């Protein structure tokens, strides 16, 4: 008799980086099949709707007044901040670079277009 003895190894597909957690640019904050959780402040969404890290900060699953009936998962650049950020305000931004204090290093970077 035919036996339905076949099934597929389940896909590890859940939050992989939880709240208040400290991520790093390019980490998987939540595998998911579906945009159950939408990309939010400072985060990126991959092909499969997987959500990843863009700035090194703190993951914060927060609703949003603008986009109702939805849930985001962002990453404030600091804990003190609340990712359901205000809006009408400056946007936290990160420079991310170290000024070549080395003469040689600076020269090479400059001299080279």
């Amino acid at each position: 008799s035919r036996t339905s003895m076949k099934d597929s190894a389940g896909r590890r597909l859940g939050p992989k980086k939880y709240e208040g957690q400290d991520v790093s640019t390019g980490e998987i904050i939540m595998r998911q099949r579906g945009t159950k959780f939408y990309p939010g402040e400072n985060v990126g969404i991959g092909k499969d709707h997987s959500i990843f890290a863009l700035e090194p900060g703190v993951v914060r699953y927060y609703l949003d007044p603008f986009h109702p009936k939805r849930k985001f998962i962002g990453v404030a650049l600091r804990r003190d901040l609340k990712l359901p950020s205000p809006h009408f305000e400056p946007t936290v931004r990160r420079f991310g670079r170290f000024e070549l204090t080395n003469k040689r290093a600076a020269y090479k970077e400059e001299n080279s277009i």
């Binding site: 609703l63 949003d64 007044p65 603008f66 109702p68 009936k69």
Partner: peptide, 9 residues
């Protein structure tokens, strides 16, 4: 929380 978010919207 969802209800509050809706109200805010």
């Amino acid at each position: 929380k969802k209800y509050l978010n809706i109200l805010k919207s």
